[PDB]
Amino acid sequence: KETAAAKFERQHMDSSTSAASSSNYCNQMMKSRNLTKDRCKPVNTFVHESLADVQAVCSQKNVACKNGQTNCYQSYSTMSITDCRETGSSKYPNCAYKTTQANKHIIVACEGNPYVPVHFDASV
Questions:
Q1: Which domain, by its residues, includes 64?
Q2: Of 2, 7, 121, 123, which is least packed with CB atoms within 10 Å of its CB?
Q3: Coiled-coil ranges per the record?
Q4: Can 48 be counted among the known catalytic residues?
């Protein structure tokens, strides 16, 4: 139903803001991107850079993915990101998330043609 590339954009891209401005950002974004739909997705990272800058990571530093695959790439530069993690008290359907803003290098898994980001591996 959703292509792998479109699902990555929906779950991780937020180019409309330069950084999460309030502690409520994660509760708002996890719901509007439909990540609290049938369950509370426990962890999710939003990247605040243009889509072209994120797609460009697929041509940057090739590294292993946590799973051992080798189609992962680490951005040469740091990027504005927001980590969203369910709190100890979150309860479907009352999903509650802790928002943590940071500037780190992102690691993404790339696939296809065009070769674009399909999974968010981690940040450093």
A1: 1-124
A2: 2
A3: none
A4: no
Sequence ranges of the binding site for substrate: 7, 10, 41-45, 66, 85
Annotated catalytic residue 105: no
Q: Is cis: bond before 114, omega within 30 of 0?
A: yes
Which residue in 48, 58, 119, 120 is the catalytic one?
A: 119
CA distance 96 to 89: 7
The bridge status of strand 72-74 relative to strand 61-63 is: antiparallel
Catalytic residue among 8, 11, 12, 97: 12
Q: What is the DSSP letter of 97?
A: E
Q: How many domains does the chain have?
A: 1
Cβ contacts of residue 90 below 8 Å, gap of 6+? 40, 96, 97
**Method underlying the structure:** X-ray
CATH number at residue 45: 3.10.130.10
